[PDB]
Amino acid sequence: VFNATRFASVYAWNRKRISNCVADYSVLYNSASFSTFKCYGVSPTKLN
Amino acid sequence: DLCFTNVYADSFVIRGDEVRQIAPGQTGVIADYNYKLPDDFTGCVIAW
């Protein structure tokens, strides 16, 4: 979903309902390839 | 019109994309591994 081959338009935005997996958000957080990272209900450090 | 006891000028160089990182309470690799401000900060920030 992040290193995807192709993304879609804004009026036809892709939705993926990701379920049943082990999540880790540190690397997604720690990756400097991502320019805009702002969370709105949870402070990101607690997302681990 | 104010007077202070001691002044502490801290100067460095960062990447120009990392300016928003320097605010207290922000969270990000520059603000998380090698320079950290307390939330009760009293002073000014200057970047150019």
Side-chain angles (χ1 to χ4, degrees):
Chain A
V1 298
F2 283 93
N3 266 9
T5 75
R6 180 71 275 171
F7 282 183
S9 78
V10 66
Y11 73 95
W13 48 274
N14 293 324
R15 156 155 276 195
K16 176 171 177 49
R17 193 196 304 243
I18 312 170
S19 303
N20 194 0
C21 53
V22 184
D24 193 294
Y25 293 169
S26 77
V27 164
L28 274 298
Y29 171 54
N30 293 330
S31 300
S33 297
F34 294 96
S35 178
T36 309
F37 178 74
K38 195 148 52 173
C39 308
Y40 265 49
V42 175
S43 298
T45 59
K46 312 274 180 180
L47 293 174
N48 214 8
Chain B
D1 311 321
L2 303 167
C3 189
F4 309 125
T5 314
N6 265 355
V7 188
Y8 289 90
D10 300 345
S11 48
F12 45 85
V13 184
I14 57 170
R15 175 180 148 172
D17 287 318
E18 308 285 340
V19 57
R20 183 197 29 90
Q21 300 297 325
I22 203 65
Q26 285 292 277
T27 300
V29 186
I30 300 304
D32 296 336
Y33 276 144
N34 62 6
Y35 200 74
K36 172 67 174 174
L37 277 192
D39 55 351
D40 62 358
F41 178 64
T42 186
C44 301
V45 307
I46 297 93
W48 73 100

